[PDB]
Amino acid sequence: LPPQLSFGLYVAAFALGFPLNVLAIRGATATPSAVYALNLGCSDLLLTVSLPLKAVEALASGAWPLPASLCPVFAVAHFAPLYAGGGFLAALSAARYLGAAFPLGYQAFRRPCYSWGVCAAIWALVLCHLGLVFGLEAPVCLEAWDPASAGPARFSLSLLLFFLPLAITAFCFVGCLRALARGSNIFEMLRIDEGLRLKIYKDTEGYYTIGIGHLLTKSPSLNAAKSELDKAIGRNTNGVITKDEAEKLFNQDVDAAVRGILRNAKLKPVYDSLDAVRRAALINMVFQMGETGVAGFTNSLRMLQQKRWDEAAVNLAKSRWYNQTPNRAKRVITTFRTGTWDAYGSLTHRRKLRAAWVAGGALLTLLLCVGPYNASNVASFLYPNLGGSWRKLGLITGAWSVVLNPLVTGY
Ligand SMILES: COc1ccc(C(=O)N(CC(C)(C)C)c2cccc(C)n2)c(N2CCC(c3cc4ccc([C@@H](CC(=O)O)C5CC5)cc4o3)CC2)c1
Secondary structure (H helix, E strand, O other), X not given: OOHHHHHHHHHHHHHHHHHHHHHHHHHHHOOHHHHHHHHHHHHHHHHHHHHHHHHHHHHOXXXXXXXXXXXXXXXXXXXXXXXXXXHHHHHHHHHHXXXXXXXXXXXXXXXXXXXXXXXXXXXXXXXXXXXXXXXXXXXXXXOOOOOHHHHHHHHHHHHHHHHHHHHHHHHHHHHHHHHHHHOOOHHHXXXXXXXXXXXXXXXXXXXXXXXXXXXXXXXXXXXXXXXXXXXXXXXXXXXXXOHHHHHHHHHHHHHHHHHHHHOOOOOHHHHHHOOHHHHHHHHHHHHHHOHHXXXXXXXXXXXXXXXXXXXXXXXXXXXXXXXXXXXXXXXXXXXXXXXXXXXXOOOOHHHHHHHHHHHHHHHHHHHHHXXXXXXXXXXXXXXXXXXXXXXXXXXXXXXXXXXXXXXXXXX
């Protein structure tokens, strides 16, 4: 409440803000998360540099110690990096959400230049919106109430530059929570193991293959492969397909791998007794080897039916399958043993957990720092009875985003 306490809290924010954000930048410079943390660290620095001036203003109970014409420029130089901070948190939470909810789809669509593009658009939108609004409608500075005529303009700032990022961050945090519960499925697992190629290639066994691990023929003839490919799609392809056609063959093959297990007497008892994750591991095998091949793993299959996970793991490792494709086999074996997705880097529960925490941290620091000011500034044009201490507090909490913001990124 007293101006001396206001002064101190700003100084604390500066004093904590400066090192923490330089440290943040180095941590980011040592993926989309890094880009957003880097731009957040920079906007935090610009905000930090304006704090000494913000602090002396609070100490003088609102008195602006500089020429009145510099007040609009300082308003931009202070609020610009402030609002940008919010948007980066919103962008970062979006990247985390997309990574958590749609790992593979995200990774396919994602390009490094988009992250910068998004960041640029944020800087652009913020400075254009603030520069115009504060430039057209501006000895007291930031502590002063805005005239009721400046309402529509200042409201558009809060609406667009805070409330919208907030709502989006809230969506991303809820989506992240949902992603945790959703875990992962067999389609994602096989997409990682088989990869994606649009040209005809040879697998580790030397057979002609296309798409997401679709076996074309066991024949050594490339022309027989090109013939079987045109059968599978019903169109002359000449050894090249689209992503859409690949995904269609993928669902048919997963279906075929499942139906193969369903009609197998030696595979079906195990399939029936497993959970979905351990089921996914079985399907992966039958996808790679076929039903008869996997049916011959008599020992391992029996141990899996009796929930003897460790024994089964050790057994499966003695196979030709393990020696020919070790990385893939180890993942499928780990899946079998644990019944989790721990073996799959971009599908793991922890990765989804970190996204939830980043988004949650982001949502909270948006609510607590940039939140209170905008909530009270819009509530100043309505309700002419509003107390002055609400906006003054909001400016303090907003300043503290230079402390909170670097913490949520984890660098
Ligand atoms: C700081 O003030 C603001 C104000 C308004 C918004 C704001 O709401 N808008 C306005 C609009 C929706 C009506 C256009 C806004 C503005 C700039 C850029 C964007 C994308 N949106 C805003 N936002 C919120 C959504 C954010 C976002 C969504 C999003 C989705 C994918 C991604 C990428 C993740 C990555 O980098 O990998 C993925 C690759 C594509 C990055 C992404 O970043 C960007 C910042 C920030």
